[PDB]
Design a protein around this ligand. Structure first.
Ligand SMILES: [Zn+2]
Ligand SMILES: [Zn+2]
Lengths: 96, 97, 114, 48, 96, 147, 122
């Protein structure tokens, strides 16, 4: 509807994708935090991460809750096809 | 056989047209060689799809790509292209029964 | 814009100033054919998007299976409900976030933008 | 206007404390001021 | 930002919308009537256009918002042109 | 710097077995098209779109010196990678190059000249749609462009 | 209190300034000597510039355009009535204050809009 106003130093597409990126990033972080708070004291992923000997918190959030946004060159997956990332989507679809 | 069938249909060879009509017709290429133009791409594409699915003149692996936005119908029959089978869908229903 | 061709050789008529009466004449070099210019603007260029996408969209995209279809914006020349909507995604705009709609019904290639 | 070999210059306030203006107060304390800094994409240092 | 405008290289192309070459041979008449009213101001006090001037015309539209954002005025643009080309280009500018 | 910007961008062609690019309209003249309307018909299929028309003005004015097919053939043969001994041999060499070396898949017979001309015009048209941004640049890694 | 001058350009500038002040018959409404006012203004401009160069000419033309326009009549009314003294009118800073109220309103509106247009750092 052309009611998103760009942030300065950023074009309208850049502002849009930045909004989407921050939304998905905070969604992943909230889900991972909630998953971490659910971990028992005997959960051995939490043992290995609390010791710091292997893995990390992001690994636990990925395996338990959400893998998250996949990025290429620091960007979401581009339209390799004509306005599509794959043949399973309508053209001009910026959904997650 | 593709060229023979297209000549048998309402396709106009580039040697036998005024350029002024080329804007209002779909350019038809065969292996990248511009064969002609056609005045109705939807009918022609449906015909070619039917023929390939029946395997009457067009053998399978012959690719018929219509760029609607650019008004182009590229037909490819050369070797080296990579293809895979897919189940045909019609009226949001499978032809497989 | 000054696209005019010679009526003898069909070559571009270049602008030429007639100092004898101070009027523009589009003259063919190498075939010396003159034509009374009336545009009075030999050349004009656009820097800030004096082009519109609705001039360029083609009605045949109503047949595209890959484009999405919505019924929330009916046509304006036949009232047909279904419309195919998409983004131009071309240069000279640099923000294709707006949508251009085509009436999906055949024989009505009416278009608009929202 | 503007000095050559320069493109759009980003004016901003550094939320990072290192780029903030650190001053010594009268009490002898380090205060980091939030101030406007300009980050360009080209370089002509003598002119600027 | 006022200092920023003194750094960011502002060329003419930044602040202009469009450009047209007209003939407009008689200068005290104009091919564009809306030009006529303010052109007659500068032809009430003509200088180097006493009864004649080169019978072409280069009209350029200047983007208002870029003039304000870069804090440019009509006078400095006219002075810059006349300095870069001496007397060879007589530049007549509308009121800002 | 002195004149390169007034003429601005203009279109060239780098044909095979030629050590130097050539203006495109010279190549069209070499295929027997003197009228600029005829050449632009093979390139621009709608003459009412002034942007595309302004795109081709620099090349047309670049090639305005030559108006004869034989002159363009002499031009090309002078720039050939195997220079002919004289104007006639240079013309024959350029004629053979256009006959066989350039766009052979369109055809290698004399009567295919028009077909080749059309194809060449289409290529220029595609380039213009790349220039005006109405089409998207093709991707080298797009696997559909592979064999 | 206008010192007369024999310079053709200066007196021509003065009479065109008077031919701007005649617009709208406000001088009839007030009853002020528009010729003397124009001579005072041109003297002030020449004192400011000390020359007949481009700055002098375009300053005079900017003032004459700002006087002639009908969308800012109260400016001319204040000038002729004496609310705006002539020496101040000679040294107005373009359209930033010497302009109608609605123009200043929209200029301040876009001045505030360019704030949100150009802060960022996200
Ligand atoms: Zn001619
Ligand atoms: Zn409709």
């Amino acid at each position: 509807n052309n009611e998103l106003e760009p942030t300065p130093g950023n074009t309208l597409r850049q502002t849009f994708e930045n909004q989407v990126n921050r939304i998905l990033n905070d969604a992943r972080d909230k889900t991972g935090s909630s998953a971490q708070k659910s971990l028992s004291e005997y959960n051995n992923f939490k043992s290995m991460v609390v010791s710091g000997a292997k893995g990390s918190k992001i690994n636990i959030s990925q395996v338990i809750a959400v893998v998250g946004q996949q990025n290429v060159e620091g960007k979401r997956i581009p339209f390799g096809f004509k306005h599509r990332t794959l043949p399973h989507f309508i053209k001009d679809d910026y959904g997650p | 056989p593709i060229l023979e069938f297209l000549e048998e249909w309402s396709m106009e060879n580039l040697e036998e047209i005024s350029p002024a009509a080329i804007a209002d017709a779909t350019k038809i290429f065969v292996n990248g060689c511009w064969v002609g133009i056609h005045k109705d791409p939807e009918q022609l594409m449906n015909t070619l799809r039917k023929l390939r699915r029946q395997m009457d003149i067009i053998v399978s692996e012959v690719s018929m790509i219509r760029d609607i936005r650019e008004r182009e119908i590229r037909i490819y029959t050369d070797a080296g292209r990579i293809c895979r089978p897919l189940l045909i869908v019609e009226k949001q229903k499978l032809l497989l029964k | 814009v000054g696209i005019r061709f010679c009526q003898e050789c069909n070559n571009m008529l270049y602008p030429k100033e007639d100092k004898e009466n101070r009027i523009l004449l589009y003259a063919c070099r190498n075939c010396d054919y003159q034509q009374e210019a009336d545009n009075s603007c030999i050349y004009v260029n656009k820097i800030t998007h004096e082009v519109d996408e609705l001039t360029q969209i083609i009605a045949d995209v109503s047949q595209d299976p890959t484009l999405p279809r919505t019924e929330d914006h009916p046509c304006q020349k036949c009232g047909h409900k279904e419309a195919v909507f998409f983004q131009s995604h071309s240069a000279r705009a640099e923000d294709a976030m707006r949508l251009y709609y085509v009436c999906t019904a055949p024989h009505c290639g009416h278009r608009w933008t929202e | 206007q503007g000095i050559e070999q320069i493109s759009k210059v980003y004016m901003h306030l550094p939320q990072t404390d290192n780029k903030k203006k650190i001053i010594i107060t009268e009490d002898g304390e380090f205060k980091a001021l939030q101030e406007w800094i300009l980050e360009t994409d080209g370089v002509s240092l003598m002119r600027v | 930002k006022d200092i920023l405008c003194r750094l960011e290289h502002t060329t003419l192309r930044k602040v202009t919308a469009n450009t047209a070459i007209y003939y407009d041979p008689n200068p005290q008449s104009t091919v564009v009537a809306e030009d006529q009213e303010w052109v007659n101001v500068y032809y009430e006090m003509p200088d180097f256009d006493v009864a004649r001037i080169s019978p072409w015309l280069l009209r350029v539209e200047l983007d208002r918002k870029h003039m304000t954002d870069r804090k440019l005025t009509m006078e400095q643009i006219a002075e810059k042109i006349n300095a870069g080309f001496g007397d060879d280009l007589n530049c007549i500018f509308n009121d800002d | 710097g002195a004149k390169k910007s007034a003429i601005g961008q203009r279109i060239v062609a780098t044909l095979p077995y030629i050590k130097q690019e050539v203006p495109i309209i010279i190549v069209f003249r070499a295929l027997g098209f003197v009228s600029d309307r005829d050449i632009l018909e093979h390139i621009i299929y709608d003459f009412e779109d002034p942007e595309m028309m302004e795109m081709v003005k620099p090349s047309l004015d670049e090639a305005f010196v030559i108006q004869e097919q034989n002159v363009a053939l002499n031009f090309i043969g002078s720039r050939g990678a195997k220079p002919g001994v004289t104007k006639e041999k240079r013309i024959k060499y350029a004629k053979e190059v256009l006959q066989k070396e350039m766009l052979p898949h369109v055809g290698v017979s004399d009567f295919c000249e028009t077909k080749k001309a059309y194809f060449l015009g289409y290529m220029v048209h595609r380039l213009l749609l790349a220039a005006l941004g109405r089409r998207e640049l093709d991707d080298r890694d797009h696997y559909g462009n592979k064999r | 209190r206008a010192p007369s001058t024999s310079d053709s350009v200066r007196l021509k500038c003065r009479e065109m300034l008077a031919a701007a002040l005649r617009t709208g018959d406000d001088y009839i409404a007030i009853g002020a000597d528009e010729e003397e006012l124009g001579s005072q203004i041109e003297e002030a401009i020449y004192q400011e510039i000390r020359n007949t160069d481009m700055k002098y000419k375009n300053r005079v033309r900017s003032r004459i355009s700002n006087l002639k326009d009908a969308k800012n009549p109260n400016l001319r009314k204040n000038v002729l009535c004496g609310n705006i003294p002539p020496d101040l009118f000679a040294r107005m800073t373009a359209e930033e204050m010497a302009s109608d109220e609605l123009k200043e309103m929209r200029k301040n509106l876009t001045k505030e809009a360019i704030r949100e247009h150009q802060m960022a750092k996200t």
